[PDB]
Design an enzyme around this catalytic site. Structure first.
Site, PDB file in Angstrom:
ATOM      1  CG  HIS A  11      -1.965  -1.205   1.338  1.00  0.00           C
ATOM      2  ND1 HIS A  11      -2.680  -1.333  -0.124  1.00  0.00           N
ATOM      3  CD2 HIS A  11      -2.066  -2.188   2.254  1.00  0.00           C
ATOM      4  CE1 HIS A  11      -3.607  -2.668   0.517  1.00  0.00           C
ATOM      5  NE2 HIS A  11      -3.317  -3.166   1.585  1.00  0.00           N
ATOM      6  NE  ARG A  19      -0.807   9.079  -7.887  1.00  0.00           N
ATOM      7  CZ  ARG A  19      -1.674  10.693  -7.876  1.00  0.00           C
ATOM      8  NH1 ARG A  19      -0.972  11.930  -7.272  1.00  0.00           N
ATOM      9  NH2 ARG A  19      -2.351  10.261  -6.844  1.00  0.00           N
ATOM     10  CG  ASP A  20       0.455   5.777 -17.690  1.00  0.00           C
ATOM     11  OD1 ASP A  20       1.112   5.541 -16.044  1.00  0.00           O
ATOM     12  OD2 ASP A  20       0.768   5.840 -18.141  1.00  0.00           O
ATOM     13  CE  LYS A  38      -4.253  -8.981  -2.911  1.00  0.00           C
ATOM     14  CB  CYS A  79      -4.493  -0.657  -9.439  1.00  0.00           C
ATOM     15  SG  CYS A  79      -3.179   0.119  -9.225  1.00  0.00           S
ATOM     16  CB  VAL A 101      -5.906   6.640   3.527  1.00  0.00           C
ATOM     17  CG1 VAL A 101      -5.902   7.418   2.617  1.00  0.00           C
ATOM     18  CG2 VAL A 101      -4.811   6.851   4.943  1.00  0.00           C
ATOM     19  CG  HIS A 112      -6.615  -3.603   7.635  1.00  0.00           C
ATOM     20  ND1 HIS A 112      -6.499  -4.949   6.367  1.00  0.00           N
ATOM     21  CD2 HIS A 112      -8.151  -2.941   7.544  1.00  0.00           C
ATOM     22  CE1 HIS A 112      -8.389  -4.547   5.630  1.00  0.00           C
ATOM     23  NE2 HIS A 112      -8.951  -3.415   6.507  1.00  0.00           N
TER      24      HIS A 112
END
EC number: 3.1.27.-
Length: 119
Positions: A11, A19-20, A38, A79, A101, A112
């Site tokens: 993470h 950031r494509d 994932k 993603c 976040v 986590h």
């Protein structure tokens, strides 16, 4: 401890370039997250110390049952898996964002990430 280092591998990415879609496809492979693929995985960018600080009153509040939510906003990239198969090749679509976040903390460290806010 082991769970905190695992959180960083899945993470955290300090300074990304573009950031494509291609960034997603490539970092997912790099971090060992493609057998099986994932369905969604979010990376946090920026300062490692701000992230740890969510676990104290400095940069976090209590949230829901057992979670903490950050006071500051972070640059993030989600993603998301495109297509039906959970087996490689994994095609991903990238979504860049900027918001607070949600994490779980254990012994002072994030262990986590709650990904329901990026779904």
């Amino acid at each position: 401890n082991s769970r905190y280092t695992h959180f960083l591998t899945q993470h955290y990415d300090a300074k990304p370039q573009g950031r494509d879609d291609r960034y997603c496809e490539s970092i997912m492979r790099r971090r060992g997250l493609t057998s099986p693929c994932k369905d969604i995985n979010t990376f946090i960018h920026g300062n490692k110390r701000s992230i740890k600080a969510i676990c104290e009153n400095k940069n976090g509040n209590p949230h829901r049952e057992n979670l903490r939510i950050s006071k500051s906003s972070f640059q993030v990239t989600a993603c998301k898996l495109h297509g039906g198969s959970p087996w490689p090749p994994c095609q991903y679509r990238a979504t860049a964002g900027f918001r607070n976040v949600v994490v779980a903390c254990e012994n002072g460290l994030p262990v986590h990430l709650d990904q329901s806010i990026f779904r």
